């Protein structure tokens, strides 16, 4: 068991476009973009990737700008579908093998490979990689060992290392990272401690630091981080408080101050935020309204904006957005989305 | 033509871990750098310190995708000579030589697989460039030319696309340009001309919305810019006014709205900048006071704040930055730097 997970996987593309990938009750993958580069630009509606999909999908930006959509598949191998041009169609859906157990975590080596990481039938950690930039044929697989018990986060560090976090036997935040950029050379799994009760989510801070978010034990919003730049030791954990009935979702404001998101007890969002700058303290607690039934998922947009995301009470896709003074009243991007989560 | 608008005097970045860093040439001819101590808006500088060489060009910084900075000068002997920081943030390597026979600045991108490809003009007058062999590493490709005759420094920037472009002035004083037909490539386009005439080096950047757009003084001494119609794609030449003493200045705000900066006639900083979002209408322009001896150096800072560096009436670097309201008052961060441009 993990927090209620995010519904969609969403991304700021390189026109400056948010574009959001959900699974439909068909089980095939649907997406949804803004025709113009703002905050409350008009969407274009859902339309079908097809597949038939069974983890969340997540899309990434390749280095070159085209989007690329992983997920598992019906026969637990990993998929893959990815734009022919950045303002281009799609290809087909295509395999690279494989059997996994949780949804794929996904970055961009240094050198531009991206590189898949996902929980397998061993419940360890494999990892698949591009063998040149932004561009198949993939390698063979091969595990990076553990035993893990959550979905993966995957993020680089400010000196190009890898690095993945997942949740341990023992409940507590673990990790293991590149010890070189674009390397096959990794570390032995160190255990973070704590006790967490969902997906961890990571952030790379304007000062070059991971930061790791996730719910407690207390359900409470939690947070540890690498002290220096891409470097041990790490800092204790340190609760942001609040009681959350989902996964937590973080993102930077254009003035880098981080702000989580998650759903209350009471069912509406809520966040908190870095205040003065982003090495200030946290606010307290506060409400943006809505009834949802996902987690929320939140970006920043090409004019700087947070917009978050979830599912409604009808399980359509809902979106609030920041304004000058305050927050705007939720939306419906339409849809029927399921969580497909591999790991729940 | 044989002249350019007076040249900026330092070459700016952002470090790995978020702090401003800005390269420039003292009266040794020596590379010398000040950084900041802490990634904020008004954070004290840690003075110059020299990381020695003998230049005969502007030097300019780049930050490799492992997060080391690297510094490209002509030198002496006028090959292209580069040193670097071994390892992330810290230490640097000795002055080593890239060879070749260049006759301006050297302008450096990275490409999509993290190897910097690194131009400039020929003994032959033509645009010549050379590349790293794997991500962020030596050892150097040869040499080789993109034909052209060039008069001023060439400016590079990446597409959304991942295809690089160069852009310099041509014989006829035109804007000129030329471009990768695919990312990471030796392949490039023939040159072509984006007409006009300019009278400073092209100042390039890439808007929220995935564009390529230039701007350069023009023959009335007016800022005027030109852009990509679409994506990766060019406009008309459009005009921004003012009458200009020196090269233009171009840097985003933290919502993305262009802000461009250059010495005015009174020898002062003057701005103008996009209004309402990142599509908006052009401001008029502004002083912002101050007796300059260089073009202005722009930048956003870790706080999303923008920053302006200029060479004052003593030689010294002087800095000003956006507050809540208005702009700081000028003060000094010390130093006595001189122009080594390649090109005047
Ligand atoms: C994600 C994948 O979706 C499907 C791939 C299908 C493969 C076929 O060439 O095109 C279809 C749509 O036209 C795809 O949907 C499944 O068959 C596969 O087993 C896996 O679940
Ligand atoms: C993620 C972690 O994986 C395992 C760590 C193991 C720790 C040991 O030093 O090396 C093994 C393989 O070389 C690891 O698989 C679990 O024992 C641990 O409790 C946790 O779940
Ligand atoms: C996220 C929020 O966290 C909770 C706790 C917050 C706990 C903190 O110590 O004080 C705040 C202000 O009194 C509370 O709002 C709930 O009150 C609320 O229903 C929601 O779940
Ligand atoms: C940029 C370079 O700077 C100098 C490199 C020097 C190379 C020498 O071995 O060590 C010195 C460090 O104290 C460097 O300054 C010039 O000799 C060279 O010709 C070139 O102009
Ligand atoms: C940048 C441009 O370089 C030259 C373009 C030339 C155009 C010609 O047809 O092909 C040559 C070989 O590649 C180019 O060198 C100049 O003649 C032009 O005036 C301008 O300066
Ligand atoms: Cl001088
Ligand atoms: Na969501
Ligand atoms: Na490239």
């Not at 990737?49 to 280095?63: A, E, M």
């Not at 609760?239 to 007890?265: H, M, Q, W, Y």
């Amino acid at each position: 068991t993990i927090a209620l997970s995010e519904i969609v996987s969403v991304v700021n593309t390189s026109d400056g476009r948010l574009e959001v990938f959900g699974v439909g009750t068909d089980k095939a993958v649907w997406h949804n973009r803004q025709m113009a580069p703002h905050t409350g630009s008009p969407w274009s509606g859902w339309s079908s990737l097809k597949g038939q999909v069974t983890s969340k999908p997540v899309v990434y930006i390749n280095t070159d700008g085209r989007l690329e959509v992983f997920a598992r598949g019906t026969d637990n191998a990993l998929w893959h579908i990815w734009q022919t041009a950045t303002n281009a169609g799609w290809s087909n859906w295509q395999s690279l093998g494989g059997v996994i157990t949780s949804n794929p975590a996904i970055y961009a080596n240094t050198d531009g490979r991206l590189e898949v990481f996902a929980r397998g039938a061993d419940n360890a950690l494999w990892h698949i990689s591009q063998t040149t930039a932004h561009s198949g044929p993939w390698s063979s697989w091969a595990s990076l060992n553990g035993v893990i018990t959550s979905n993966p986060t995957v993020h680089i560090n400010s000196d190009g290392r890898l690095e993945v976090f997942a949740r341990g036997t023992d409940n507590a935040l673990w990790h293991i990272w590149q010890t070189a950029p674009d390397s096959n050379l990794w570390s032995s799994w160190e255990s973070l401690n704590g006790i967490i009760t969902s997906d961890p989510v990571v952030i790379d801070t304007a000062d070059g630091r991971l930061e790791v978010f996730a719910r407690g034990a207390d359900n409470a919003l939690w947070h540890i981080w690498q002290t220096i730049s891409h470097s041990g030791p790490w800092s204790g954990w340190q609760s942001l408080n609040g009681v959350i009935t989902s996964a937590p979702a973080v993102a930077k404001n254009c003035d880098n101050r981080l702000e989580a998101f998650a759903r209350g007890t009471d069912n509406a969002l809520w966040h908190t935020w870095q205040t003065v700058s982003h090495s200030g303290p946290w606010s307290s607690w506060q409400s943006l309204n809505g009834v949802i039934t996902s987690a929320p998922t939140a970006v920043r947009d090409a004019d700087g904006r947070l917009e978050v995301f979830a599912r409604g009470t009808d399980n359509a896709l809902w979106l609030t957005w920041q304004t000058a003074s305050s927050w705007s009243p939720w939306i419906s991007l339409g849809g029927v989305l399921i969580d497909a989560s591999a790991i729940k």
